[PDB]
Amino acid sequence: NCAATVESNDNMQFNTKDIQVSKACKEFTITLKHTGTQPKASMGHNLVIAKAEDMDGVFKDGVGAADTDYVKPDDARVVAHTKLIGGGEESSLTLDPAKLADGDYKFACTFPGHGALMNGKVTLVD
Ligand SMILES: [Zn+2]
Structure with missing residues (x-):
């Protein structure tokens, strides 16, 4: 829903x-x-x-940003992101699907090193 x-x-x-x-x-x-x-x-x-x-580019800039969830703050390239979490935790994000209509979007974990294994597609559907 x-x-x-x-x-x-x-x-x-x-x-x-x-x-x-x-x-x-x-x-x-x-x-x-x-x-x-x-x-x-x-x-x-x-x-x-x-x-x-x-x-x-988001990965590379995330490296210097450990205290802001490994995401460079105020980064126009990042549509939305959750907090960084450890075991037994959860975090959410909220986005306007309209912001995804202008390109091919992916999701990833930007914790240094994780991105190559932890990434995927974000797909607009009906
Ligand atoms: Zn990770």
């Missing part, structure tokens, strides 16, 4: 490669759960939405 739940674990994996977002929604909420037991310092996960072509 204009909401989806994505899982993440101690093995550097999301449980999906595609998040479908209905453009019939005024707002869409994505909740990330961390089902592992490791702390966010060593196995932190977030969910960060940006154009495929912007994601590499």
Whole structure:
């Protein structure tokens, strides 16, 4: 109902490669759960939405941003993002699906190193 739940674990994996977002929604909420037991310092996960072509730059700038969820603040490339979470925690984001109509969007964890394994597509659907 204009909401989806994505899982993440101690093995550097999301449980999906595609998040479908209905453009019939005024707002869409994505909740990330961390089902592992490791702390966010060593196995932190977030969910960060940006154009495929912007994601590499978003990763690189996220490195210097550990105290802001490994996302450079005020970054126009980032449509939305959750907080960084550790084992047993959850964080949500809210976005306007209309913001995704202008490109091909991806999601990833921007915790340094995680992005190559923890990424996928964000897909507008009916
Ligand atoms: Zn992560």
